[PDB]
Amino acid sequence: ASVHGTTYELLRRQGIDTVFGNPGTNELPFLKDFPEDFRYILALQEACVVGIADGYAQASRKPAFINLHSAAGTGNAMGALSNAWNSHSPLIVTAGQQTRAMIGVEALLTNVDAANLPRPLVKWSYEPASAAEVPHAMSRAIHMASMAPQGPVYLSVPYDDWDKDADPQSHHLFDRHVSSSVRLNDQDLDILVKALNSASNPAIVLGPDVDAANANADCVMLAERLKAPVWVAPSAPRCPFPTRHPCFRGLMPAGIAAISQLLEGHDVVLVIGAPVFRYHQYDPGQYLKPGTRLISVTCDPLEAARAPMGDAIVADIGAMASALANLVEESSRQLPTAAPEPAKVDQDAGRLHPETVFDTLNDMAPENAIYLNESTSTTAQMWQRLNMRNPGSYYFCAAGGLGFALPAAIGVQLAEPERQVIAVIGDGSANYSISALWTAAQYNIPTIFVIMNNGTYGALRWFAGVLEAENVPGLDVPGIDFRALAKGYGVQALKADNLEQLKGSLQEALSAKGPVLIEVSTVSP
Amino acid sequence: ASVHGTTYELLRRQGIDTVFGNPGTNELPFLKDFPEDFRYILALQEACVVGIADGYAQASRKPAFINLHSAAGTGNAMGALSNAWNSHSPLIVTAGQQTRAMIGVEALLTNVDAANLPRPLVKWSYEPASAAEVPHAMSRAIHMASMAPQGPVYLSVPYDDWDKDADPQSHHLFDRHVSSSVRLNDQDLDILVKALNSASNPAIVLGPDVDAANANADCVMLAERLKAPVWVAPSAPRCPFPTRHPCFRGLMPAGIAAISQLLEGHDVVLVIGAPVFRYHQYDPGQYLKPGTRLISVTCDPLEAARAPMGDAIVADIGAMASALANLVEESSRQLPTAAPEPAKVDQDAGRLHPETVFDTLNDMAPENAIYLNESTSTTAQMWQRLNMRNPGSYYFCAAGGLGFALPAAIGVQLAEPERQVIAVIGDGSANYSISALWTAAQYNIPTIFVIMNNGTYGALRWFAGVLEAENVPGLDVPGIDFRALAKGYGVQALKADNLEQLKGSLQEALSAKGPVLIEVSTVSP
Amino acid sequence: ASVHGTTYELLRRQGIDTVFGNPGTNELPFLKDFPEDFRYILALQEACVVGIADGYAQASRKPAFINLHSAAGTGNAMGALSNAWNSHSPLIVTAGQQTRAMIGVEALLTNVDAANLPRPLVKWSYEPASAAEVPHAMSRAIHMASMAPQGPVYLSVPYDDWDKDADPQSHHLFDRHVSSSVRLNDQDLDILVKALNSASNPAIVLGPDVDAANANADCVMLAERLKAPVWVAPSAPRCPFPTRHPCFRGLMPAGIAAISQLLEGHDVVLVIGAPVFRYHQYDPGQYLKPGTRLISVTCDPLEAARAPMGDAIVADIGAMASALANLVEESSRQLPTAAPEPAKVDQDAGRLHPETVFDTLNDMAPENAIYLNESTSTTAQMWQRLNMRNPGSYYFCAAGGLGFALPAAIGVQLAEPERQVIAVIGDGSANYSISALWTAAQYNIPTIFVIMNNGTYGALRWFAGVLEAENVPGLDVPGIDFRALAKGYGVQALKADNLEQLKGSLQEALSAKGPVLIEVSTVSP
């Protein structure tokens, strides 16, 4: 068999059937004779390719396979890889290299130093030393991406390798099963359970890794048994809990002092599937107040090492959440009371307040909608106003890297054909990966894109307001016509200048058979 | 003085007055109190930021200063950095880092391992160990980017550094002058000159570094004195010679066997300011034929080391070209005859042949136009059909990385306000950095964008045709409306479906006061 | 031809005839059928291998070829590579890799990530993508090591590559000549010369790169014409000037404030072939005093970039020194007066004062002796007391990395069979590369090793005295018998407990036919 044939067999035997890519000449020998059981999803730029794959992987809870062109293609994607790293997204990034005979002279399209290019944003990066090694290296890539803590990996392949004879012994790779589904040993797990059972006022903090593991339901049970309030860890890339559950307390402020104040009086704080902590703004203070101790369960040694406080357990989030939910006692304490609904903000017949947009979305969207957020100045409001009862209902750039939500919303919609995806993206953010729209059009992936247009990089104007920073250039982005951009890429486009039109546009979008972009005129900050 | 004040003074004292950027919160403390003598050029995505800066640097023949946001912003730009590396573009890339107090915990927006991120595509990559070091590190960056062989460099700065007190001794940085304007010693230069003088049938091969040095005129003189044919080295990122000069022989084929055949019978081949060689397609054969010896002058040790044949001299291209042009004797040989004009291809009243487009451009454009090429299947024709008599008249992604020409054409037009820039870009390539259009609109930089629309990734269909590769997915890009995209970003848009309309559109574009995009319906391959 | 045969031919055609190594199984296929015209120099540990090669390269002023075993062998040498980096030593370090078929599984002896191992201490690091590429990669290594600024480079080769068929076109590599012998262009050189000619009180500062280039004699001439005092740049790895010349002012203190004070009143300071500056101790102050300006000539862009003050020219030191020495005018100023001889320190009939040892060496050694220094607390005295009139007469770990002088003295003696090498090494430093002695014994390389034994890490006790640091552990090294160590490795050993015995031992050593070690009982600090 050829390296080509063996590699495709390894992929399908490992459950991979889709290639997200933007092609080049180094990749032609790989893409030729494309398997009929495989599907190729083209995007027009590599940040879009990787973003779509990322959304697909996160929503599907399985690895996504990517094929990019050499150094330039890989480099175009490395902003996307920065989010993928922070979101533990299992992405297998392959890139084509020049033929071995021409790597030395550095012919055009040679990926020099290839493995070093994507670092430090990958778990594993490699170029095989011979054609026969390619399937083995692909096996390594598949497993490195998939093992806890999941993450992106990189494989560079000289284009002449594909047609070479494969090693007959490569068949041993095909059905390899590797498991990291592990939990704390019985003795120490009992100690933990006893500590939660004995807590007088426990609190729970959940991260994105909870949603990735589909441990949401177990976390509800654990919270119910412990009669404990549940917060989402700061800078949240996913939603790990029903936002309308009586225990839910919302998104934590991304500040050291703010979080210690919030947790004050809680004697034991159990953090599950989240970094400790993902702070953002500088909020000097105590990491924890006297009387509060912290216990973190994380799938990622790097997270456990860098936590500035608390004990930590490195294990699988699914296995740990299941175990805890089932072991802990049913506390006699009174179940926490549900947070009151958000107030309705005054709204005139003009520009729309972000709050109004989210209320309307909540009123009109299906109960199993999936939201993506890249409207950076309205995150707090979005979390307060959208009722997300099911898992996999929220996605936000884990590294704060813009250009995520637009493509990722397309990958999410591809992974969940029966759940309406609605991406809420600011006018600034929309541009980073605008060409992603074309993929939704071409494959008729019916994502709804809600563009929040206030003409400025609002979150930056705000941060600059706090720093009392004057004379900062480059904060306004006037003069963009998002309906024209959507038309340019074949996506149906609507405009909403007021509530009447917002309701009308949403009704039309929700009834449409393909992707739709709605440009919303929001108030200026 | 503050680190902020000292750094801006260092920049202006070193001739930098423009910041190409896309801002973030880590960068606010740097951008605040922006100097009135400085100018900020905003682009909507980092590949566009770096591409514009790249064109500006190459055309201006000086370093360009870039400011990006942390890891995600830097990563979005690394495809652009791959071209910059191959084109020796002096780019000073700065990125904002999290405050020092929060780097350890890996707060959101922390650039982890920052210096390793942009490698291997930079000459120098660094994050200073203290705020007071920032000006010194900026000095290092400026000089590393500017010294031969020029190239991109990377500096990461924690945002809390800017307001800190600068080291009083930093003033010694301000007026530092560093020179790499060097040439071969007298004795060995005389030996070289004697070898050229004694050559019976010399040939000259010029690379992009010739145009970068403005050594074009000296190369004409050298060619005239030696009565030698002049070729442009393969995969040419710039134009180093008048394409209508009697000595000019055009662009070399990017193949080993093709080049040795071309040079057969030439006893001495002098290569100046070019890699040896930038091959592309695999064309196995002799590097040089018996009787041909090669001498390379290059500014880049890496080029000299990796040449598979010939002698090499590592020195400044400007200094070497001047010295050779002035020292060599005036050969009694007959001056080479000028290549005959390209034939006129049959053109009906329908879709336009690439050849027709280039002939029309040549007929209508000013004699001092500057072209950019990202129409990958029509490169050979472009070189044959465009009369470029002056330096700085051609630019093409040095690393083959698409997404270059659109933004770079804007930077070129900014650097050369009196020379009409015309970017010829295929429908595929146009998408990679489409959002760059907005910058041309906002700053009224009057670049003309000619979009060659044949609905496919033509060069890939061709390479696949040679490999007889069947069933390759992802090669067609139908359904893009480039006039709508231009409208989306505020650029005047025209359409040319035939020659009559092409002539009309060009006439309008050439008379316009701002940027214009013309979508041209070209024939399908 | 085989890759083995082609590579050895490339080496000999490029002037390499010696392999410094410590062998392993990955290297057997390379070392087998060892060429009869080649010579193998074995050392017992890799720090010793590289140190011997380093001394050989520096003294011979040509590249030295090294062969080490995989990761462990390369890693044992990386302390040696840190000195080599700082001394611009042209070292070609090759290491054997596992067979390509077993690199994937990470068999024992696999060098994982090989090219990344030696960074950042090499100019170039590489593992070829195929056997046929090996000669081309070796060519790249040879030239990267040899081009200005010279430095160590690293090449990893899978052991199965050697027996494979070489590319017939590799013959083009054999006689490649690459030159970096360049100097400042005429116009700017004239400007420099005019500035030196106009200087009212110029001073000259020389670095190791001057001795490496053999530019010593030209620097004497330049100093004589300018009637200028000459200092050696701080932390000096070599001696660039006759220490008894009327212009010589000795070794500069390694402190910022000390150097600016020293240069005060000098209007133009010309630094040649040295970093600016290699400081050591923290001596806060002005980099230069008002009225002093600095001009640096360096072969190394990295040095020019990081100088905190002055103008810089990046060019070949040999070419620049020759040009300046020959162009500058003969100043009418009075030639500087020669520094007075060092005073004779009081010495009883007991332990020897370092000063006494150096005076005695100066009295007894041939005028063309070559010294090495790794007696860290007595450097200042050594420089004052040893008359070194010729080039290549002094070597000291450029990176301050101990374990250099012992092996390097053996390589120096190998390169200069007619010049008596005398290494002066403290009892602490002697241990780092003690096994190097065996190589001197086995090959009868007649280096003299003078061990300065005061029982302590003296320089550390001193630095700790300045920091008033109390309770520092690990500063004493009692209980080492250096005569027994020498006997262990087959080197004749003597002991000197007083001046009478020191004189006697030196007389015997100087008359000996092989290597000799003399243990000297020096006074405790």
Ligand SMILES: Cc1ncc(Cn2c(C)c(CCOP(=O)(O)OP(=O)(O)O)sc2=O)c(N)n1
């Ligand atoms: C790739 C990238 N570039 C730049 C930024 C910096 N940045 C920028 C540019 C922001 C403004 C986003 O503006 P928007 O219009 O999408 O939303 P708001 O107006 O609600 O802030 S938020 C922020 O962190 C980033 N995070 N990622």
Ligand SMILES: Cc1ncc(Cn2c(C)c(CCOP(=O)(O)OP(=O)(O)O)sc2=O)c(N)n1
């Ligand atoms: C960033 C990047 N991605 C992918 C490619 C691969 N690629 C692609 C996608 C090409 C087709 C460009 O199509 P076009 O429409 O711009 O021009 P033609 O139709 O004339 O080829 S040429 C080529 O090398 C690339 N070079 N750079």
Ligand SMILES: Cc1ncc(Cn2c(C)c(CCOP(=O)(O)OP(=O)(O)O)sc2=O)c(N)n1
């Ligand atoms: C490889 C290495 N390890 C440790 C040191 C630290 N070190 C040490 C250990 C010194 C003492 C050398 O002691 P010595 O006996 O050779 O000489 P003195 O007694 O004259 O200082 S000097 C110094 O920098 C070093 N420079 N290099």
Ligand SMILES: [Ca+2]
């Ligand atoms: Ca906005």
Ligand SMILES: [Ca+2]
């Ligand atoms: Ca096309």
Ligand SMILES: [Ca+2]
């Ligand atoms: Ca000692």
Ligand SMILES: [Mg+2]
């Ligand atoms: Mg990298």
